[PDB]
Design a protein around this ligand. Structure first.
Ligand SMILES: Nc1ncnc2c1ncn2[C@@H]1O[C@H](COP(=O)(O)OP(=O)(O)O)[C@@H](O)[C@H]1O
Ligand SMILES: O=C(O)c1cc(-c2ccc(Cl)cc2)c2cc[nH]c2c1
Ligand SMILES: O=C(O)[C@@H]1CCCC[C@H]1C(=O)O
Ligand SMILES: [Mg+2]
Ligand SMILES: [Mg+2]
Length: 259
């Protein structure tokens, strides 16, 4: 349970974070490969997010699902906080999308099924992820999707305040929100997986804000009827109008292309 930096051999950086970096690491005694998320105390204090960090730790450490990234523990020293995470060897869904440009209907529907199942488990504990995006979706050794970065995670309902690309209208506007925010994020993902870019993508935060607020998006011609139907059902301005995850999992386009 009590760890120290001296218990780990540090490898290359795995990625850059908002409050520090993620490094590959090996526990000296067991030779267990893992990821160490290193955060700077000064930066967290200045941002006034030292309690949201405690929330990320508390929420993620109690989740057990094959499509959710494990958080084994944490420790800290005079300047830094260290989160001990499960290593996701095939990287981010973000990098996969950058090299493939777009995913086919089968890969998309499979990822959407994996997400819906992980989100269903979260929502059963009244946990809202609120930061579902390709760079927070990691790939296990078998290429299985793993929800990661519980940095902004909270318990529903919440009226608590990167790009806005995956945030629903109620979360922007700083209004009260529940588990329905993750259903909106799911529709933005589905679109991005098939099209290569999120539906409200813009040059500025200001322009993206407006597009989300208006639910202003169009589909390229290659997007099928079934895909258009599922996305359009998820991207409802009214959170109450968004379907349950059970409905997403039973959608004909999902059942026909997954897995
Ligand atoms: N367990 C992990 N295995 C592999 N890469 C990881 C892991 N955790 C994070 N990363 C990489 O580091 C990046 C930043 O990690 P993350 O927890 O998402 O940080 P932040 O809250 O700053 O955005 C990720 O997008 C990813 O590229
Ligand atoms: O004890 C401390 O002295 C302490 C502690 C923390 C801290 C916060 C969250 C977690 Cl999960 C672990 C440690 C932080 C975060 C910023 N300044 C700190 C000081
Ligand atoms: O883990 C982190 O980098 C942060 C902890 C504090 C809240 C915000 C969070 C994040 O950016 O994901
Ligand atoms: Mg992240
Ligand atoms: Mg984060």
């Amino acid at each position: 349970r009590q760890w120290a930096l001296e218990d780990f051999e540090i490898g290359r950086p795995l990625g850059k974070g908002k409050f520090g970096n993620v490094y590959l690491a090996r526990e000296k005694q067991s030779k267990f490969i893992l990821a160490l998320k290193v955060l700077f105390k000064a930066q967290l204090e200045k941002a006034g997010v030292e309690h949201q960090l405690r929330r990320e730790v508390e929420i993620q450490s109690h989740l057990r699902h094959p499509n959710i990234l494990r958080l084994y523990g944490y420790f800290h020293d005079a300047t830094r906080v260290y989160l001990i995470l499960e290593y996701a060897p095939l990287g981010t869904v973000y990098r996969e999308l950058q090299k493939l440009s777009k995913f086919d209907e089968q890969r998309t529907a499979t990822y959407i099924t994996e997400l819906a199942n992980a989100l269903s488990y979260c929502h059963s504990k009244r946990v809202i992820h609120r930061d579902i995006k390709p760079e927070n979706l990691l790939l296990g050794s078998a290429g299985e999707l793993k929800i990661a970065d519980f940095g902004w995670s909270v318990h529903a309902p919440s009226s608590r305040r990167g790009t806005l690309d995956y945030l629903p209208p109620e979360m922007i506007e700083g209004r009260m929100h529940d588990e329905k925010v993750d259903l909106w994020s799911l529709g933005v993902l589905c679109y991005e997986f098939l099209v290569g870019k999120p539906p409200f993508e813009a040059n500025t935060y200001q322009e993206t804000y407006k597009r989300i607020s208006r639910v202003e998006f169009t589909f390229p011609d290659f997007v099928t009827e079934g895909a258009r139907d599922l996305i359009s059902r998820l991207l409802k301005h009214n959170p109450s109008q968004r379907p349950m995850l059970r409905e997403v999992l039973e959608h004909p386009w999902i059942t026909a292309n997954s897995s």
